[PDB]
Each structure stands twice: as C-alpha cells, then as structure tokens.
Design a protein around this ligand. Sequence first.
Ligand SMILES: OC[C@H]1O[C@@H](O)[C@H](O)[C@@H](O)[C@H]1O
Length: 329
Amino acid sequence: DKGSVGIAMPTKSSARWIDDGNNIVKQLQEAGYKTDLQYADDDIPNQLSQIENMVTKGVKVLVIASIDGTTLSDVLKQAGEQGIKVIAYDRLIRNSGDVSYYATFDNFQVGVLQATSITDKLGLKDGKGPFNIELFGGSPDDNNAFFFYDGAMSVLKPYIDSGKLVVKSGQMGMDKVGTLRWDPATAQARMDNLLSAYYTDAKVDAVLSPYDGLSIGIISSLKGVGYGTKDQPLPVVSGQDAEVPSVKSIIAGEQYSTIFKDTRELAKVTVNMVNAVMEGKEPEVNDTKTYENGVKVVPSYLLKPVAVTKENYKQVLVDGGYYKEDQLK
Ligand SMILES: OC[C@H]1O[C@@H](O)[C@H](O)[C@@H](O)[C@H]1O
C-alpha cells in the first residue's frame, strides 16, 4: 500500500510504449505500488479523459507519455491542486507549471547518433562527396522531434553548408519535414513525392529518418522506384527504437541503423523518481537547464542512447536480453 500510480501511454501502434508500460508496471509493483496503466490509441481526447480519471481516482503520482501534452494543462492544474506529482515520461509536457520531473533519453544525442551513422557510412570525414540527402522529422506536437532534428542538424549542417551534402528537394526545418503523429503511411507518401519531383535523374544517397516506423515506409517508397536491387542499392537510412521489423531490415542489409533506447532503464529511472516523491526526497536529476517547457525548465534525468547497426545488433539487443535470438529470425 505504498500508494497508487497512474500511467498514461499514448498508443500501441508504436512498439515501444507496450514495453514502457509493461516495464513501468512490473517495476512499480515490485516496489510495492498499485498501478493504473492506460493506453489512448493515439486519441488526444481519450488520453485527456484517462488522465482526468486517474486524478479523480486519487493516484499519488502521474507518469504521462503524452500524444500532445499542451492539451493537459487544465487536468495537470487539478492534479497539482490535489497534491499529485507529475512525471513527464519520455516526451516533455509543455505549457504547464505542474510538471514536476522529466525522465527521458538524451534526445539531442539521439539526433547526433542518427546523423553520425549516416555521415560515417558515407565517408564524409574522408572527404567523400557530394551526396544527396533528404530529411524527415517526427510529430510537431512531440517536443522530442525538435531535439532529434536539431541534434542531427548539428552534425549534418556543416556538410550541407560546404556542399558535401545536398538536400535536393530543398526541404528543411520541422515545419516542412515533420511527420504528424509519426505516421509511416504519411512518410511513405512524402518520400514517393520527393522521388518523383527531385530524383527522376539524380539518386538519393541517404535519408535521415528519426523513427523506425518511418524508416520502413521510406524504404518501401524507395523500393517502389527501383532501389534495393544489386545495380541500385538502397540509400543509407537511419532510425530509432530498434523495433523488430527494422532490426530484421538492418540484419537483411536494408535499413542501415537504428537507436536502441532500453525502456527497462527508463522504467527504472521512473521508479526511482516515484520512490523519491513518495519518501519525500528529491529525485536524482542530471539536467536542470535543457528542457524548457514554456512555463519553466523541468528538472530532468537523461539516459544515454545506443546506436545499432548490422554490426552490433546481437551484442546490444540480444545479449542484453531485450529480444530473444529467435525473434530476429
Ligand atoms: O513513437 C514515435 C517516437 O516518439 C518519440 O517521442 C519517442 O521518443 C521515440 O522513441 C519514438 O517512439
């Protein structure tokens, strides 16, 4: 009876949130808490309704991975009036003074890693170039998407400036490359139209993809126009989440890279935070400057992500138990 914790996850259409949810609940119950885990099927009104009910139920702490956190201002105010502490999980909740802590991966660094996998593969440090690249971003209502993109551009921009990388479509910036709701179908269509408009004569050499779901759609589009044959190899395509279909793609020599974010580690950080709040102590945080949310800078704990390719998938994903060997066959 250490108290109840409400856990709001955005959707099951992206594999990780099932893992986040399972891992948070497993560790919280091990720590002796009761849990109320809900998934919103990416429906913003539903997620709001779910969190409202957690508040009415009288949970002591809310752990929220929001679809669009800006929609939660009113309910989080009510949570604060009731003495409920709020942990933003993975994605920062913006526009609210009632967000107490933020547990996440180093999102800027995720972007650095995605871009670096591409630049390393292209040999840009060896003076290789020029190459054509197209850019994709996440959902614009996901605060993480801006960090993934910015982190990537910290690596790519100097090469784009020098001409060694060329964005042939000229499309850059989250307002132009963002992919609403991280929808793979949308990214696939955009890739379709980039190819027809700008790559009838030229070839795509790389695509910055911020998420595995998108990477698979992008690859499908590329195969639709003849890439992925012996004569015409796929461009270098990044990713994130180490979803099984993308890992299989990487093993097959299609998708080039992904980013492994161990949800077991993020659940553990979250439990540490819950424990602290419940004991009346200050949670461990390692970043109190970065994550401005529009009202304040939320004290945060950042975990370090790991880049995965065909070269290291076994050691990173299987040896550490995230997946079993057979799942990747
Ligand atoms: O769901 C699409 C993406 O959403 C981001 O906010 C999250 O950090 C990524 O790991 C990925 O899951």
